[PDB]
Amino acid sequence: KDIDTLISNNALWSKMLVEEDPGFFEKLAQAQKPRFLWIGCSDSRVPAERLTGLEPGELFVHRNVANLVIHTDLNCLSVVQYAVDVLEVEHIIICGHYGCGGVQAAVENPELGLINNWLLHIRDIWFKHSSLLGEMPQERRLDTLCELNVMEQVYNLGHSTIMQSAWKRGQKVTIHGWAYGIHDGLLRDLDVTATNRETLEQRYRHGISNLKLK
Amino acid sequence: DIDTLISNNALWSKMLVEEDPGFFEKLAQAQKPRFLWIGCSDSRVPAERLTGLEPGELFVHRNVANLVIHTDLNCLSVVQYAVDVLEVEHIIICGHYGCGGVQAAVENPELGLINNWLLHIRDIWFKHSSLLGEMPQERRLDTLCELNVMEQVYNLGHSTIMQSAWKRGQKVTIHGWAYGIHDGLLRDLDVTATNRETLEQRYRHGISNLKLK
Amino acid sequence: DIDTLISNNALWSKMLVEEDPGFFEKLAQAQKPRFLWIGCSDSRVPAERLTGLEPGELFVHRNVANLVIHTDLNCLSVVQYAVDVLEVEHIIICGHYGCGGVQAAVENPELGLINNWLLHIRDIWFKHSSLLGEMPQERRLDTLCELNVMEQVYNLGHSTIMQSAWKRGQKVTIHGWAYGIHDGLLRDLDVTATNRETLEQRYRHGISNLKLK
């Protein structure tokens, strides 16, 4: 496709719904705040809406290379703060995916340019868990790192002043760490689910151990 | 709730695997996206559905109010990776009328940390105060939404990432669009640039023509 | 070279310990800085020497061209810590004429990554194009240096950190200064603000008076 093609597809697409199912735009026209914040990868192999079967506007979304939650990235932190303190989302999902180009670039470490800086946050994880990854079959390491990464980001998110404050105020917010593959688009729960400053630390330590023992 | 999502995903997967056991094979066939879509976290209408693109055809970045801040490494990293590594041919910055981020910037309510990010939009509101001034107070937010996309397109074109990509002769086109929720119809703000010179020319006329419509 | 530095440090330390064995005790007496100095990495003349302040009396931040970007967490963290934790009474943003960062922004040479950071200064150059235009092309860089400090002061005052500090009644004053290398004499750009309202008023008159001098 080319630009004129997308514009044509939209023109036709819109013309239908506006005559066929006008109700579609009526539902969107409703000021219904999203209940979920989806933090995923720019690769966007399978759109979050399609993966979860959710209607348009039910998901507040943020995407960056390799779905990271860097302690000091004000882009993601701002998305999170608006979602939590203003939209008051009930759930936050950090979703990674096996085969992610970002994660792979972090390991193979080619000289890609500017992006390698952002990817060093993933290499820190690669090293941090060098014992767990080394005690594994080579062709399983990238998929494992992919899970470790999501788990580390969930942890980072829980430690952010935004979440600590939300939880201290007693606000009900739950963060999840998910992952999926393009061979079945089936979501796998990495069970690092946190609902407060306590369950966050335990579920994290437990999430990691599981992989370390299984 | 959450449980529902995992269920929808389970069924959806099963259903597709049965109806089209190739659907996922198609995705498996590693296909590099040809487009980079920079939109708002509000994501009122998925980019895939607006453009009629299938999964994987779009590399995507979303932040509040679809900004391209000169010094935001998050967005810049997505752009550099898409341009230098994926070699996308097109970059689309798309805004949407009624955007909460845009409205929050004008009304200026005390929302917390997010207000710092929104100050970049307030800069635009004040930058175009005359143009917006001589205009019905009602149409101002929608115009600011358009001005914002146009300004972010301008920023994107001025980034060292785009300036060096164009300098080495790489073919990359950046676009500025916007759509409304009442019809989901995309509007080309006409600031499409293929190099440094047209970026300047399109921005100039882009703003100038608004002061005519 | 490096070796020289360690030697100078060795001797300097010895010499002080012998002349004033209390000098270091003085520093030891944990004293919270009352001022935050935001200057340029060029650091032509140390802040301590310009102001006649002794070590530890200044909490400091330096970046290229002394910017306070709305969304730069580096500078914002230094500001929040100094304001909410150290409780500094004054914040000074100081620029200097002949600044390489400021000049690089106007001349626009291809310097690499740093050009993205400098785009914030180019925004200011274009923002005040009329004022700078009706002016000798020779005095433009120096004026841009002043405009830049004034704009960064404005940004600092609009940050949620300063807005919430002032809202809770905390006493914090922000200043905008500049000095030249030919005399190291500080010039108050007169954009001193103690709250939200005066920040706006001082900025307005600050720019307006320049269009008079």
Next chain:
Amino acid sequence: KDIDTLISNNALWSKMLVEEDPGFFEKLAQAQKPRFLWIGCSDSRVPAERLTGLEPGELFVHRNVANLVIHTDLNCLSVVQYAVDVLEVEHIIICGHYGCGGVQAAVENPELGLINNWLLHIRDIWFKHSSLLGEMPQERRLDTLCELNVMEQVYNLGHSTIMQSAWKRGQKVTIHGWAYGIHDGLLRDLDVTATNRETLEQRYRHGISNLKLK
């Protein structure tokens, strides 16, 4: 002192040099590029110029809370890139100091607000070396972390695309990790000195081991 006091001190200070030693401003008037980039802490207990006995303008400087070099902080990365690629500094010094309020806030972890996000990068180090720090007398841990921090930043700096590129191009640049105390203002070399992509990795591993064995 108050604002009017600083302005007065400057007025008097300037009036002297301009009549006493006009040569001072003549030397500055010379377009002599700095040969060193100093990355230190905002605390600035003892000014870098005074610590090294260097004249004004001989040091390009950057300061942030706890002298960090975050993989993705474009503020510091931009200072570094300008210094290395434009000024062509020969040496880069990351200097920490014992007693640093930032490092201490990272450990004690009080609820300071926004700043705690930036400090999580130091807590990652605290945990990373939990074995080395735990096998130590409590009242020695903060000073140790202070060194570990500087060492980790030097490492981060060496891994940045800016340094990797400079070294690949064959440009001569050396990065050092220093530290000092306010009891004597004496600079201590943490010997993690890197001059290329090779010495960087070894000196790092060695720098850490030393503390781990001594």
